[PDB]
From a paper:
pmcFanzor (Fz) is a eukaryotic programmable ωRNA-guided endonuclease 1,2. Fzs and the prokaryotic CRISPR-Cas12 systems evolved from distinct variants of TnpB, a widespread prokaryotic Obligate Mobile Element-guided Activity (OMEGA) system 1–7. To explore this diversity at the structural and functional level, we resolved the cryo-EM structures of three Fz1 proteins from different species spanning two kingdoms of eukaryotes: Guillardia theta (GtFz1) (algae), Spizellomyces punctatus (SpuFz1) (fungus), and Parasitella parasitica (PpFz1) (mycoparasite). The overall structures of the three Fz1 proteins show notable similarities, all featuring a bilobed architecture and accommodating the ωRNA and target DNA in comparable ways, consistent with TnpB structures 8,9.
We determined the structures of the GtFz1-ωRNA binary complex at resolution of 4.7 Å, a GtFz1-ωRNA-target DNA ternary complex with a target DNA containing TAM duplex and a single-strand TS at resolution of 3.3 Å, a GtFz1-ωRNA-target DNA ternary complex with full double-strand target DNA at resolution of 3.0 Å, respectively. To elucidate the conformational changes before and after R-loop formation in Fz1, we compared the binary (State I) and ternary (State II and State III) complexes of GtFz1. Although the overarching structures of GtFz1 and its ωRNA are similar in these complexes, there are clear conformational changes in the REC domain and the RNA guide region. Comparison of State I and State II, wherein the TAM has been recognized and the TS is forming base-pairs with the guide, shows that the α3 of the REC domain undergoes a shift of approximately 2 Å to accommodate TAM duplex binding. The guide region of the ωRNA, which is stabilized by both the WED and REC domains before and after DNA binding, shifts toward the REC domain by roughly 2 Å upon base pairing with the TS.
Numbering used by the authors: 2 to 182, 204 to 393, 415 to 580, 599 to 670
RNA sequence: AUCCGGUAACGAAACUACCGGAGACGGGUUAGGAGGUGACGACCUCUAAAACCUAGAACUUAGAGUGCAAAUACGAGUGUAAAAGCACUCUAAGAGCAUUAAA
């Protein structure tokens, strides 16, 4: 199906009287989720010491959906398991609640208190979607960063054994290629002979214990290794940021928040008068009943049911009487070949400052089902995606780069940091956050080190949340998104004007050949008439205005256009070995001075030609 | 304090130096422009804002328009009688979120 999102400010969307409830709901959601994540993280660490190496008669611990749900109940002070019924399958899961409950007592050094976290509002339903995001986070972190752990462990070992820090990466790469394509890998799972990549995607939980072991050794085993090389990772993600996070609100969730039995009667009377049908609702919880019993008759089609959801939002929100409704009232973009029509999807995501609207295709609205010759005339350009500079563009006679500093100035980097320090320093919390908490780095995986950090934060949790609850922090969170487009769009506009006119010089770039001059003199007047090369190593928005192509990156930083062989290496022969100075290693070269951007970008463009 | 461009010492740097332009989130609070002598200044008026305070808005780029701010001479050496910037309407091209995280 087709799904799209629209992001706008939340001002005016909610009614004035109901605005207070929404604001307070966000605070409770962040506190419960943040505390729950720490409790879950601590529990898993204890399981690591329970059995390692793993036994052959038991399966690895995999976190299920109800694990996080029980954790939230413990935080709120629930005294008994939420499990319903008795059966062989629930024999083990029932006892797990007691173990987790005991762990919560062990984490803190004081008697648990219930009302320090409970809230009178019934915000249980909202927490349902927040759990899903955390669960999916573990899979993404394990699969993506697994290869990084392997290289670092081998890299640290080489450094410890006295081997030079230059060949350590090469040695690690050789081992990594063989195993991927001694104790850092398990036995091959798939019997079909496929590479280990398929095995990694088969299940991420199997490899999670291995990463935990790697981190523990890195903290203490490699004492002599330099601090810079020992960059600790976070195999177990957890919500550490104190800033409130976003939440998802649906029709069922919205009713549980704002609807009340006394106020419910007003909705029933309004619906009956305006539609002539009386709802079969007698209590607040009856609003979640199936469509069959709501009216006593069944809908003729799936799209009919969707219309019911839309009207519910109108009563509790100014959906059709707000400024933002202009872009959601069946607006069709000018450049859609299919002429698709979109409408509100009865879903809202907000954090109290910014609101994101979910809009789906009209054709699929309701109950969804289960789920070449242009190169001759076009002007050619190449790119060399580096690290210091996000992107670089060359044409054989001049170069332009999108430096990291350019984005920093556009995003108001200095102001954001300046404002944050001053506001926090007013309450005196700066010393505790930096001087104290820095001694107990959160990325540590040992139970003892983590326990010290966990209890320390709990003591100052009340003060920290109030200080970080100021909207100023969230305002900057929206500012970066708004300014991100401006920084990227302006650079793309500069690209057109940079090469719109024929180059005014023909001899400054001595390395330029006859072919380079022929392409430079070409005149362009449209965005789509320019073709920009790209490499395997931001491209989402660039392709929307300019056509792109892929070029191999093999040996693109050593080859030279007018030499018998590779001649590019780091500059030598001077007392100072500067950061990015490059000098040719032979006199038979068109140019003796080179830099990272021009040296690599020029070769990429040459291959395209 | 930083970004961009040029200049040499064979498309050279976080210092090898110099020169010409941008910019410091929103609101209240300071110095610059224009005008009762569009001569300077004597006296006032419209806009605007670095340091400080503060629970506080906004979909993005190229261009086209409208709409703003009012109070030297004649004569019998002599008396006196449009800029910075901002707001709105348009055209063209775009328009999917929440987070974990790093060489
Ligand atoms: Zn060469």
């Amino acid at each position: 199906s087709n799904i799209r999102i629209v992001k706008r400010k939340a001002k005016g969307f909610f009614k004035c009287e109901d605005l207070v409830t929404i604001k307070d709901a966000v605070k409770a959601a962040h506190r419960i989720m943040s505390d729950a994540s720490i409790l879950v993280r601590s529990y898993y660490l204890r399981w690591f010491q329970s059995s390692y190496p793993l036994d052959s008669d038991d399966k690895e611990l995999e976190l299920e959906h109800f694990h996080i749900s029980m954790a939230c109940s413990i935080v709120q002070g629930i005294t008994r398991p939420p499990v319903r019924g008795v059966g062989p399958e629930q024999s083990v899961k029932i006892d797990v609640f007691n173990d987790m409950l005991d762990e919560y007592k062990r984490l803190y050094e004081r008697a648990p208190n219930d009302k320090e976290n409970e809230t009178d509002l019934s915000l249980s339903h909202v927490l349902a979607y927040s759990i899903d995001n955390l669960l999916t986070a573990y899979k993404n972190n394990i699969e993506a960063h697994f290869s990084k752990y392997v290289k670092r462990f081998i890299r640290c070992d080489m450094l410890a054994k006295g081997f030079n820090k230059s060949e350590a990466n090469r040695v690690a790469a050789i081992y990594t290629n063989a195993y991927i394509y001694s104790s850092l890998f398990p036995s091959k799972i798939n019997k079909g002979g496929f590479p280990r990549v398929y095995d990694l995607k088969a299940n991420p939980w199997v490899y999670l214990p291995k990463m935990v072991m790697i981190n523990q050794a890195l903290e203490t085993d490699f004492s002599s290794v330099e601090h810079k090389e020992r960059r600790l990772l976070n195999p177990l993600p957890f919500y550490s940021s104190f800033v409130p996070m976003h939440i998802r609100i649906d029709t069922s969730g919205l009713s549980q928040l704002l609807m009340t039995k006394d106020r419910l009667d007003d909705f029933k009377r309004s619906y009956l008068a305006e539609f002539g049908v009386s709802l079969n609702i007698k209590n607040k919880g009856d609003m979640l009943a199936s469509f069959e019993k709501i009216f006593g008759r069944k809908a003729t089609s799936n799209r009919e049911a969707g219309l019911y959801a839309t009207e519910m939002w109108s009563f509790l929100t100014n959906l059709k009487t707000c400024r933002q409704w202009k872009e959601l009232d069946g607006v069709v973009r000018k450049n859609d070949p299919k002429g698709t029509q979109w409408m509100f999807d009865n879903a809202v995501v907000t954090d109290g400052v910014s609101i994101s609207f979910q809009v789906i295709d009209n054709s699929m609205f309701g109950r969804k089902a289960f789920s070449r010759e242009e190169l001759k005339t076009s002007k050619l350009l190449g790119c060399d995606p580096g690290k210091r500079d996000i992107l670089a563009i060359t044409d054989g006679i001049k170069t332009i780069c999108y430096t990291k500093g350019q984005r920093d100035m556009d995003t108001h980097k200095t102001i954001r940091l300046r404002t944050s320090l001053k506001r926090r320093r007013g309450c005196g919390l700066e010393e505790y956050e930096t001087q104290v908490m820095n001694r107990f780095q959160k990325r540590s995986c040992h139970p003892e080190m983590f326990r010290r950090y966990a209890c320390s934060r709990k003591r100052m949790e009340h003060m920290l949340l109030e200080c970080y609850s100021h909207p100023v922090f969230r305002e900057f969170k929206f500012l970066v998104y708004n300014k991100t487009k401006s920084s990227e769009h302006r650079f793309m506009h500069r690209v057109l004007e940079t090469f719109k006119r024929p180059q005014t010089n023909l001899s400054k770039a001595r390395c330029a050949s006859g072919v380079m001059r022929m392409n430079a003199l070409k005149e362009v007047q449209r965005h789509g008439d320019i073709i920009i090369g790209w490499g395997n190593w931001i491209r989402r928005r660039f392709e929307s205005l300019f056509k792109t192509t892929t070029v191999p990156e093999h040996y693109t930083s050593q080859e030279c256009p007018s030499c018998k062989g590779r001649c590019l290496r780091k500059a030598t022969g001077n007392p100072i070995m500067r950061h990015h100075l490059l000098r040719c290693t032979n006199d038979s070269c068109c140019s003796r001075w080179w830099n990272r951007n021009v040296a690599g970008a020029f070769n990429i463009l040459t291959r395209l030609l």
